[PDB]
Write a protein that binds this ligand. Structure first.
Ligand SMILES: NC(=O)c1ccc[n+]([C@@H]2O[C@H](COP(=O)([O-])OP(=O)(O)OC[C@H]3O[C@@H](n4cnc5c(N)ncnc54)[C@H](OP(=O)(O)O)[C@@H]3O)[C@@H](O)[C@H]2O)c1
Ligand SMILES: Cc1c(S(=O)(=O)c2ccc(=O)[nH]n2)oc2ccc(Cl)cc12
Length: 315
């Protein structure tokens, strides 16, 4: 099935297009091509600095009547410098304005860590540590709930929250809306079994980011493990007459996850969508899971002293 039912009663496409690092002069075409070849879910964020250009593509495809707005599922994320109650609505509205939308399908707290507001996305002290905000995650959640009640967003969720932080939200006094989604890094080298089971047991849908291991991440080191080049994964793909990327995308789908591979290459955008016509066996799935090594693309390494840094915790 192409969509998963969320705890807000809406359905979310299990395959979406990622847009982190998609250059602004390429992302409009990427999103146009994606919609043309079947994608109905785009993963966005203000911090990616390309929402205007994503929006141009969405608006053109709506105008062309390639798709209806109700058939699209557009996700964005509240950046860390906007955790303050009085800044959340304006951050959401800037994203809506850039994406050329009147509502988002899903709006996520991008990270649990709040930073000092201002122009800088990573405000630093003179010694290089990120400068925190005193705003706690629970008050930021209350501000997210208001966006649902104002009609700006259909669903709210979280991203990069560890198990205890998810629990904190679920245990919030006076909680009005549960998170619909927790978007986390997940691939065969970071399989996330504990966090995924917890979220799924609470009815929170998990989205897997960096499913191909983000080979374009800015801090890649040549010695790092490489999913797309792992001969063991290549062998599973060859057995199924699929590409390694197609296996890497199908894998989270069969764990009841949503998955958001990024590409700006038209052929790969189309490739990555052709994952609804084959099945990995249970043995394939367990074999892929066995490759876990707790290896992260995204460890927010500049924020490790923040009180809310998510990755000291086991999960
Ligand atoms: N919530 C968060 O904190 C967070 C963090 C990280 C990522 N995300 C989201 O998750 C999305 C996906 O993660 P990601 O961008 O880190 O990396 P990814 O999707 O794991 O990998 C993207 C890279 O793989 C390449 N690629 C794509 N399809 C390919 C294929 N079929 N064959 C070979 N190479 C292929 C892309 O190249 P080309 O583009 O050159 O084709 C790009 O270099 C992001 O774009 C963003 O939307 C969210
Ligand atoms: C890692 C990391 C990043 S990132 O790598 O810039 C990133 C990448 C992509 C993205 O979508 N979000 N962030 O930002 C953070 C902010 C707070 C914390 Cl605790 C960790 C990080």
């Amino acid at each position: 099935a192409s969509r998963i039912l969320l705890n807000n009663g809406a359905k979310m496409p299990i395959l979406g297009l990622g847009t982190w690092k998609s250059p602004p002069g390429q992302v409009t075409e990427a999103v146009k091509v994606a919609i043309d070849v079947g994608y109905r879910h785009i993963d966005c964020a203000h911090v990616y600095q390309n929402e205007n250009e994503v929006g141009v593509a969405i608006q053109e495809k709506l105008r062309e009547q390639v798709v209806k707005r109700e058939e699209l599922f557009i996700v964005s994320k509240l950046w860390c410098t906007y955790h303050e109650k009085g800044l959340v609505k304006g951050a959401c509205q800037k994203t809506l304005s850039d994406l050329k939308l009147d509502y988002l399908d899903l709006y996520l707290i991008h990270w649990p860590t709040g930073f000092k507001p201002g122009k800088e996305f990573f405000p630093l002290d003179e010694s290089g540590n990120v400068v925190p905000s005193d705003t706690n995650i629970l008050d930021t959640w209350a501000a997210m709930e208001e966006l649902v009640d104002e009609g700006l967003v259909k669903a709210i969720g979280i991203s990069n929250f560890n198990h205890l932080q998810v629990e904190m939200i679920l245990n919030k006094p006076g909680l009005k809306y549960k998170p619909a989604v927790n978007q986390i890094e997940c691939h065969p080298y970071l399989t996330q079994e504990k966090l995924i089971q917890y979220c799924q047991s609470k009815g929170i849908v998990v989205t897997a980011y960096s499913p191909l291991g983000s080979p374009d991440r800015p801090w890649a080191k040549p010695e790092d493990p490489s999913l797309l080049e792992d001969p063991r994964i290549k062998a599973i793909a060859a057995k199924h007459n699929k590409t390694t990327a197609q296996v890497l995308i199908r894998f989270p789908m069969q764990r009841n996850l949503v998955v958001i591979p990024k590409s700006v290459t038209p052929e790969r955008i189309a490739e990555n969508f052709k994952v609804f016509d084959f099945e990995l066996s249970s043995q394939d799935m367990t074999t892929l899971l066995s490759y876990n090594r707790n290896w992260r693309v995204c460890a927010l390494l500049s924020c490790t002293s923040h009180k809310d840094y998510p990755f000291h915790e086991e999960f």
